[model samples]
Structure formats: C-alpha cells, structure tokens
Target: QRSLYIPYAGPVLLEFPLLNKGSAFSMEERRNFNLLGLLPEVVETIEEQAERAWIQYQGFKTEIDKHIYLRNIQDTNETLFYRLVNNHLDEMMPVIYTPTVGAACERFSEIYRRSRGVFISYQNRHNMDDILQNVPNHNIKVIVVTDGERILGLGDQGIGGMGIPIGKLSLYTACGGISPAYTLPVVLDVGTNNQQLLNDPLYMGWRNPRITDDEYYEFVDEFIQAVKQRWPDVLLQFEDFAQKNAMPLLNRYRNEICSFNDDIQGTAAVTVGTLIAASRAAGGQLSEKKIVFRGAGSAGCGIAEMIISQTQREGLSEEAARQKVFMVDRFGLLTDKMPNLLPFQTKLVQKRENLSDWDTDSDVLSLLDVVRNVKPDILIGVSGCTGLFTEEIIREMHKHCPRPIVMPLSNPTSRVEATPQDIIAWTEGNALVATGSPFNPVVWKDKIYPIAQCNNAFIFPGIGLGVIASGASRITDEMLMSASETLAQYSPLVLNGEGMVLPELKDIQKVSRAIAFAVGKMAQQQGVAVKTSAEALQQAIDDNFWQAEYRDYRRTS
Candidate 1:
C-alpha cells in the first residue's frame, strides 16, 4: 500500500554568524527581506569580520593555507573577503590571484570541494543552451571565459582554468563593486594539449588533444553567440587564450559583441597607465620617452600600441611614435630579417625594416646591446624567460639615463626577469622599477628602494565596472585610452622614482570609480553608451560602490 506523506515543517533555512553581517539592512529591511532572526542578536560590523579574518589568516603556517582561508572567506562572506584583501593587498594580491592562483589551478581537482564556476565542455556542443540555463543566476552582466591554453606562464591546465575566471570576477566584485549576482565565471573546455593533465586520473577536463583549426573557432563562435543571445548587454572578457587564437578571436568579435581580451587589451591599458605615471614621476613627458620591451606576445604588442597611441596624441608624428618603441622576442629585436613574424608583429617589423640602419640578421642581441644602442628611458620585460634581465642590463640602463625605468611584467615571482634587489643594487638605487608580481622593498646601502607592482588589477576591474555601468554597446579603443589617462591621474602622488603609478589596492574602489567615470564619459562621447547622462552614470556608479564594512542584523522575532 502506498503511504501518503504529510507536510511537516515550513521552509528550512541555515544560519551562520560567520556568513551573514546583519547591519547590511535596517531592522525593517531585514524583516521584509526574510532575514528576520536569521542573524545573531549582536550586530557585528565589517571591520569586526575583517579583524576575525586577519586573525584566522595569522594562524596559517603557509601561503597555501592562507590562500585556502581567504578563499573560504570569499565563498562565505564576500564583503569581508574584499575588506581583508583591500586592507592587506600587498600580502594578498599574489595569494588570491596571479602567481598563487596559477598553482591553485594546477592542483584544483585535488582540492575541489565547492562549486565556483560554470563549466562548458566540447561534449556540451549540442546542449549549449541547456548548459547555460543550468547556471543559477539569470542576471549575469559580466562573463570572463578561458580555455586554459595559457594560464600565466604555466601553460595549459585544461578545464582547471576555471580558477582564472573565478579569481578575476572576484576582483570585479571586490575591486569594482560589480554586483556579485551579475558576474559569471565560465570555462570552455575544448581539450587539453598537456599530456600530464591527460594522464592524471583526477583531471576534470576532456581527455583529448586540443582542437585547433576550424573546429576550435567554431566552438568559440557558438559560445559567444549563445552568451550574447542570453545576456545582450553582458561584457565578455577573454582570458588565457593562446597567442595563435587570442588576436583572431578578439578581432572577430570585438566590434560585433560587447567584449575585449584582457590578456591583450587590458594588459596594454594598465602597462600604459604605469608608463604615464612613470613619465610624471621621472619629470619627463611620455612623448620624449624611448621604450623597449623584452617580449612580443599579447602583452608586449598591446603595450606598444598604447604607447604609440599615447605618444601620437602628444603631438609626435606617427613616424616618431614608431621610432620611439622597440621590442625583443625569442629571436631578439623584431626586424624584417626575422624569417617568421606573427601577424601582430608584422606592422612594427615592416616599419623598422624600411629603416636602412636597422639590422635584422643580428643574432638575438643581448639586453645590454639593446640598452646601449636604444638608450631607452624605459625597459619592460614580459619575456617570461626568467633572469633574462642581467645585472649588466640594469647597470647599462642606469649609465644611459638617470632614474632609468625597469618593469619586468611577468607572472610568478620565479619567472621575473629581474628582482628589486638586482635593480637597486645594479643601478645603485637609481633605477625606477616595477614588476608584474609583488616584491619586497629593497634596502641598498642607506636608501630603501620601494618596488612597485604594475599589475593589470589596477585598471581592468574599473574598466569592467565602467563598461557595465555605462551600458556600453561595445568596448572601444577610445575607452581604453580613457582608462590609461584616468590611471595616470591617480598616479600623481605615487608616480615618482621608485614609486607606484597605480593607486594602492586598498583604494581600488575609488580608483575603479574614477575609471568608470572616465570610461563612461568617453563611451558617451563615442556615442556607444546607452545612458546619455554622464552625471547619472557617475551617480549610479557611486551608489553601487561596495563598502568595506560588514553589516549586522538584529533579531526581530
């Protein structure tokens, strides 16, 4: 005989003091919003939560433990997570993102316990629509997606690449105050090129060789179309795509969709921001500065383009702007004689090749040789070839210019071309140095050398927030230029010899607000902003800004 079930209890809910801050809403707001009696009787502020998290962090014996503790905080109470990170950015940036995040992705499947992002695999080709529907939220305004082709310098990690999008969007909320519900992290698992991942039984991605050629592009196209169809206004951010696919995908969809490649464009804007700040700090004009880069991948080319654009805007002739920049790749200084030039490097190669004095046949020229010949005011390294910036390179740069600028913008402290100590010691504390990764302050003799991190975090969060707030139809080059300038404005105080160009991470909200205002105004001027009133846009952004303090709720029932 079948038994009839009787209704027993009302809707069940879970309560944890560690999870909810009751002060976020008024007592009436809490009761009306179904939060009555959910919180503890005492109202604990965000500051209190932050203090608790700091104490918890202090108990960690290793960076990994601290990382796990921070992730747990972020998962439970995002506000407190940002408060802790904002208060301790220098200690946490590498932990929650970048270098540490790379390691976390490598070991993700081993430590996987909680769900953080949406995973779409090649197997879901026919079920793309259904897979997307499974996502819990319907109001996704921003999506950062990756295929794991290049996770920093660590190379492909297959589906484990989800960590990047998750970590990135966390910054979107923490640094930019983008509503958490409106952000999504997605991983497009085509396949893995890494044999180690394929052999690992615990690996969570598709077990096949990476699909390239037409099939790869087709999958990407379908994914983009599906997302746009669901959320038309959503900002699509491309991360970690390999060089072969990065530029092509960006060009194909940039105008057709509201999207941009962070690896290429975001890195460019932030690096340019640092340079703009550096120029002011060094008491020199951007147009007057000669720059050299040690890598020619997405980061290198993007930086070169922005630098050229900035120089051209400063009244320098186009020819002069091109002349002011030089780049070295694995094959050495990019010149016409290089047998194979990537599409992105073609224009620069052509321009330089036409110059009769430029030599293309020279065996990969040493950094010292390039420094002596170019006498560059600034030298940037993104080569990912560790220890490439030798002592000779730093010393030669110092000999050529006072307060010579050196930025080794590579990830993972181990992969840095040079360290703050090398820069300070070789240059006798005269080099103005910044890096992609954090470094300890160097004490050379009696003077302390403050090394700055020119991380992309400074600009991307604000740029993403601005695009979302402005209801931008598409991200434009003009928007990026505006971001560069806005970042420069924020650097007035820190833009000095051995000083930071971007604002401190703790001030990321203010930095993001300013960036949003600038980009929103630029979008309106470009006639792409759906919202016409810049004042209204600024007000909306200001209203949406996330406070660092946690709120507590008092029990009413």
Candidate 2:
C-alpha cells in the first residue's frame, strides 16, 4: 500500500470521484494505492481520457443530457472531468452554468438521483451541528450557500437550487485552480413560494408555507456560525438570495466574518470592471461618465457603490461621487420619499427633483423615462422585467452619446432588456454592448461587433482564489477594487478598442491568476494577509492551486 498521508485509501479512496482517477491511473499508482483489479487492463493518459470523454460528451444532443452526463463524469472521475472542461470551457460553460444550469435547477428534484449537498431543512433547524456533520469533510476553504429563494433569474425552486452552489464550486476549481476538496455546497431549505414546485409530487424540499423574517435570520445565523466553527479560514459566498434577505445577510456578517454575497459584490466587480473597460471607448475616465442602473436590488446597488468608490479613490469626496449615480427601482427614480429605504439603498438613491428634462407632476416613471432623462454614458438593466429597453430607449441614448455603453444584464436568456443584434442595428454600430447571456457577434455594414458576457463567473472565482491563497481574514473594498482593476486590464476593449469589455471566457484561467495575484497584493497592503512578504505571495498562490493531473501514489521513504 502507498504510505502517503492520504485521507482515504483502498476501496474507500477508489469510490470517491475526487480520489478516483479511473482508467487513467498508472499501473504503478493502482498497485501502490491497492486498486489492482478495480479497472480494465488498458491504462489511459489525461489527454486520451479527455479526448474520449469529449467524444462521449458530443453524443448527448440535448442540454440537459450534456449537463447530466458531465455531472456523471464529475461523480466518477474528477481528473477526467476537469480535463474535459478545462479543454472545452466555452462549450461546457453554457451547459454547466447559465441557461442549461437554470433548466437543471428547475427539474432537479425530478431528475436528481443523489443527494450531494448539505440540506438544512426546517425539520432539522435546531440541529445545525447534526445537519452539518453529514457534510463530507471539514478542511473546507470555501463555502457557497443558497436558501433556494432566488435561483439565478428563476424564482423559488426550493432545494432544487443546489445546482448553483455545485456549479460555482466546480468553476472555482476548473477556472481558478481552487481545490475541490476544500469546497462545500450548502442548501438551506426554508420552503418554497413557487406554486408549481409545491404542487409537484417529486419535490424533495420541506413542504411548508415558507419561513419568514425572524426564523429565517436566526437560521442564517446558526448556519454561518456552524460553518465558521468548522474552518475559520474558509471564505463563505452567498448566492441567489432574494433582495430582502441578501442585503441584510451580507451586512450582518461581513464586518465580523470573511464573507461576501456574490450576486451583490461579484456582480458589482464585473459590472464596474467592464464599465472601466468601456470608459476607454468613451474617451474619458470612468468618473467623468454619468451612469444609470434600472434596478435598485443588492446587485445593482452594490455595482453603483463600487463605481462611487472608484470616484472617491480618484480624490473625489463622498457627496461628489454619489452625484454621478442614478438608480431606478419599481417606484422609478429612487428618492428619499421611497418608503422603508435600506441603508445600502441610500448610498446611490437620488431625489431627481432638480431635473429640468420633464415630468414634474407624474408620481410614477418607467425604466425608459429614467434612461432618457439621464442621457447616461452607461445604462445597465437588472430590473428582472423583460423587453423594457425599447428601440426608442436605445435611439434616445444613441442621439446624445456617440458610443453609449448598454448592458442588459438580466439573468436567463428571456429576461434581458434588449438583444445584442437589436442594440447594434438601433445604434448604427456606435453602441458598446455586453449581456448576461452568451450571444454571437452581430454582422452589420460589413463589421463584426462581438458581445461581451457580463457573467459573475468572471471575477468571483478569482476573488475566492485570492482570499484562500493569502489567507485573508476578511474581504475589503480595496481588495475588490484591486480585483476589478486587475480584470479591467484583460478587457477586450482595453486590449484593442473593439475587444470584449471583459476578458473572453476562453482566457478565464489566465485572467483568474492575474486577479488572484492583484487581490493577494492588495490584501497584504490592507494588513490582512497571513503571508509575510510580496516575494512570497505569488509563489504561495501558485502553490495553493489544485492541479487536475493525477499525482502518482507513492510511499514516503
């Protein structure tokens, strides 16, 4: 037997996808690890296995088929799984995340055969320790937790939201080289508000009316404390939480714990990173540009905060920085009069009472009304309302600004404000565009305008990698700015005026490394890094990465 300090060995080791290399294992490795008869006689290399897996992957015609098949690979052979995706990331991302993954979450209960994630149902709310003890390991360095209340653009799907956490951790490994062994996926089932899910007999979640304010917050507190107790070094990321809960949850733990809400912070970083990229096209600095967001939820508000923070970093005062931002929620144009305004919402909320454009008597305004009034240098939509950014909105935007930055970053393919093709034709090729989903470049007037994807996957993994590598006690605004600035360097627009606003998905692995390096250095500057010197930082980050190649099992002499 191999005398290595492995956590598992023999049958126990071979059974796990994280440990199992399948037929790719060498004869020496198999014998040393005591897996002599577990596989066929023929051995395979990582490349050969990935090539064959690709062939098998091609056989699946439907998106769900491909999603399930790829997951099956991850459950059987992680080495093969990562190699396959690292080789074909672009093709696999849509299937593994975004559109296909959205479908998976919708049908998770009906299709799922294995209960993989940590499910803390209302039935077992009292036993946080007992529920968490069922989780496989405690060396966890990252935790992606969701309450299944808001799953990617889709509403409540109950425990079906496990796909988000699972997919996020997978991306953290394949895109940024984080160890899968050090990751945990958690689902806090507080019950579902979706009538369809409740009506379905196949639903596995707790069939109840749904836990409200007091009970929900208390449960979140217990869950956070339980996970922290396991590994204080671990970075916890909040995902797909509703606006009401997401904002409060992040604020509650952020100051005292090493945590962040990805939808809020990660979305903000990507949006601002792209905004910085688009600024080069606008012929000025980001601070010089006026911006508008069509939603005032956590994601939109956080994005606004980062932009304001950038202005402050450039020597502008807090009040001056707040002047550049205009946010419109359901009430249209967030004002002090809006009933029950959250503290974070107040950061970017404007009175708009001084506006000379029009409409003094109208108590209500639409997204179109705000877009036209701002004459915005940049317009972002996260309103969750479909088809709101009309042709008239784009035309009005194009009339004033030569190169208006338009990003319709609503989730799923259907909820977006406008399509890339429509934006191109409407602007007569002057609009710079990025979107929430993948879209092909529009060919007009013998020009190709490639659309950039404003996916949260771009910066979140990189941010997570840096925190884990530097052993940063808490994530800071400066560190997030560092992440955004680093990512902006790789933007297509920055590299060559016409490239994608953010780095293309194909270059994500490399982009992740650069962001991680910057984040680690920034953490050190903020006095939170555990590592000693700048000289040691880069090497520590590289050393911390978990490579997918199978290491030979050998005895320690």
Candidate 3:
C-alpha cells in the first residue's frame, strides 16, 4: 500500500509565493517545493484568477450575495480573492470591508459555517491558556480582539464582535500581504451591556450584564499574558471596544505589550491623512486650516489629538493648536460648563469666561453654529447620530472656505451625517468629501467627483504589518504618527471640481506599502525593530505576503 505521506511528496507551491509567480523563480524551484503533480498540466496565473472572480462577482444580484461569494473565496482561496479585490477595489471594497461587513457582523451567527477564529468567552477566562493552546496554529504573528462593545455604528454585538477580528485580520493579509497562517482572530465575550442581546435566546455571549472593573480587567490581563507567553512575536490589536474601555485598555497595555487600539489610532491616522491631502489641494497647510469637529468620542477626540500633534510639529504652539480646534459633542460645543465631560474631550473644552460673546450659548450651538463661528476649513463628524450635517451646514461651510473639507465619518452608510450628493450640491461642487463608509462617485456640474473612503482599512493593515515585520516590543504613538504621515504621502489627487482630495481605493496596495515602509522605519528609529536595516525589514515584509495561485502535491506510487 502507498503510504499516506507519499501522496503529498511532489512539488507544492506555497500560497505566498504563488501570488507572484512571475518573480525570479524557476519551474525546477516550484517542483522542488512539491508543487509538481497537484497543479493542472496548464499553469494558471493570479491575473487569470482575478479576472475570473471579477466576471463571476459581477453576476451576483445583491450586495449580500456578493459578500457571501467573496468571503467563501477568501476562506478557500485567499490569493484569488485578494487578487480580485486588488484589481477591482473600487467595485468590491464596500462589499468586503465596511458597510456590508457591518451587515455581515449582524448576521454572522446565521451565516456560520466553519469558525475561522478563536472564540474566548467569559467562561474560558480562567482556562485562557488552555484555550490559547486549542488554536490550530501556534505561530500566530497578530491577534485582533473585540469584546463586542461597539461594532461599527451598530452598537454592542455581544459575542458577535467576532466579526471585527475576522474582518480586520482579513485586511491584514489581503492589504498588507501578511501570511494567513501567522494571523489569529479573537473575541473576548464578557457579556452584553445591551439588554436586547441579553434577552435574546439566539445571543451567543455570556447572558449577564457586562463585566466591569476587577473582573473585566483581570480577564483581559490574563488573556494578554497567556497569549504573549504562547506567541512572543505576536502583535495584539484591540478592536471595537467602547469609549469607556478603549482608551484605558490601550493606555494600560500600550507600553507593556505589542498592541494598539484601531478605533483610536487607526481612525486618527486615516482621518488626518485625508486632511493632509486635502490641505494640499486647498492650497494650504495643516497649520493654516481651522477645524470644527462634531462629536468628541474616542474617534473624534483621537482625530483632534493627532491634528494638534501635527500642528505642534509644524512650529505652532500647543496653545495655538488647541485654539484652532472647535469640538461639539452631544450637549453641543465642548465648554468648561458642560458637566462631567470625558477626560479625552476636556482638552477641547473652552473655559466659560474665555468664550467670545457669540460663544456664550455654545452648549446649545448646533454643528452649523460652530461652523459659522469657527469658519473652519474642515468639518468632521463622528457623532454616530445621523442626518446632522444638513444642507445648510455644507452651504455655510462653503461660504467660509472655498474648498471646505467635510468628513461625515459615522459608519454603515445609514449613520452618515451627510451623503456625498448632498455635500456636492450644497457646496456647489466645491466641497472635498471623504466618508467612513463608501459612497458612489458624485457627478456635479458636468464634472465627476470620486468620493474617497476614509475607512480605517488604509491605516490598520499596514500598522499591523509593520508591527509583525519589525517584531516590535510595543506599539507607540510615534509608530501611529508614522502611519499617518505614510498614508498622507500615498494620498493621490483626483478631479473634484475646483479641488481634489484623498486617494482612490484602487491604490490600496500602494498605500499599504507606504504605511508599512513608514512604520517599519519608525520601528527601527525607536530601536524596536528585530531587523537592523530598512531594506531588510521591507524584504521581511515581502517574504510574509500570501501569493495568489494554486499549489500542487504529488501522489505517491
């Protein structure tokens, strides 16, 4: 009888190298690697697979169907899926990444087939180490974890937060070329703060109120310690935690662990990157622009902090940078008189006595009021509350700044503050708009305005890639700053009437490469890089990427 091991003896092309078959490698090399008999007699290429998937994807009638098809391809044949996305990014990004993925998260349990990630429930906390051992692969290089607190704009998903980790790691491989075998997705299911999820029989998490204080922190600490102990080279990514938990969790672990919060720093980097490109298009610099922010939660405050940092770097005094940012929260403009403001929002709070005469009633001032008083060159919204960026707000912004930048960055399309069409028409085609969710290109006054997606995908993939490539001991704000600058440098110009801003999603790979380069360099500068040289680090990154081709295994006689 032929031995079972003998069936797998011939040449097998590794998935990572398979994607770049045209690179300098020989057929003998392929055969030596055991890829000989398993592949077809005719050698198929990644480009051919991409074209095939694109043509097939076009036949799907609904977005959900398209997502299902693409996700299946992702699970079974990663290279083809990524190649397809890399080629048809403008058409497929929304389906794979943001708005549709938000929907996918909601229905994940229903769509359950094979579980792609590790599900660490509250019950598993005490035995977290054992659970970590259960993961199929022990060579994990990155882990993305969510507690189901804030999933997109959909609020708490309880155990369903697994989707965030899965989606995030998908981008890690698809965008940054991280090896699939070296990635892990984890969901820490504490319980649900949302009563609806708690009451539902279908709910998959702990059926109690969310754990807090000692219980919560202890569980998280244990999980971190156990995972790092098991995989020392791994980078942990915190995802989708609420404002109350996100910042503190990041602060506690940031200096001690190889981790960072995507919502806080990744959002900040991409938002600022868009602004950096916008400033160039507006015939100005970041320091010359005044910004008004609507909503001061983690995402909003994070963006504000990064912009202030940028201004300070450009020779502006700290006080001056603080003065240029006007933040409006739920109770209206952040003023000293606003009771019990979160510490993160306090920096933007204007002292009651220092306000101009028009600012006295700032607590009641709507977004439009802030725009009028501040005459901000940019208006950013992250309120998670919808329809607040009225037509009047866009028109007023246009009157103040010729190429006003409007970022209605709430997620899942429906929660957006304003649509691209509204901004384009209201600003008479002068507004440069980017959004957290994808928007179709807007044509106004005989010109096409390609709306740039300001999704965190552009930032987090490379950040994770850098962390993995450098094998950094810990993630730092300096690394995040590098991610922002790298992203800005990759922001290509497109025609948007009188002004242009933001890069096309089709260039995601280029953006990812830039961010990876910057982050890798930052890692070296901080003395955290495992590899000494920049060129070496980049080659290491290239070595980890998954390739888009089929491999062959020989059958033994």
Score residue 301 of candidate 3 by CA lDDT.
78
- Residue 411's lDDT within candidate 3 is 75
Give per-residue lDDT, candidate 3, residue 410. Answer: 82
Question: What is candidate 2's lDDT per residue for 1-557, written digit by digit as tens?
Answer: 12434656577777788778778767887777777887788898899899999999999989999999999998888878998998999999888877788889999988997766688888877898877677766478888999888877678888899998999889999888898778888999888898898889988888876788898888888888887777777899999998788878888898767888888888888878888888876687788888888888767887788889887876788887787788888777786566788787977766655664555435566667776677788888888788778889888888788888989988766788888888889988888898877788889989898888878887888888898788898888888888888888897677886677887778888898888988988888888886567767778778877777877655332
* Per-candidate TM-score against the hidden true structure: 0.88, 0.93, 0.86
Ordered from best to worst lDDT, the candidate numbers read: 2, 1, 3
Clashing pairs in 1: 21-551, 22-551, 22-552, 22-553, 23-551, 23-552, 23-553, 46-550
lDDT (tens digit, per residue) of candidate 3 on 358-428: 64363576667778777889888888777888877777778878878888888767888888898888888
lDDT for 92 in candidate 2 is: 96
Candidate 2 lDDT for residue 223: 83
**Which prediction has more favorable TM-score, 1 or 3?**
1
Please identify which of the two predictions, 2 or 3, would achieve the higher lDDT against the true structure. Answer: 2
Query: Which candidate should be chosen as best, given lDDT against the real structure?
Result: 2
Sliding window of 10 residues with minimal summed lDDT for model 2 = 1-10
TM-score of 3: 0.86
Each candidate structure's count of clashing pairs: 8, 0, 9
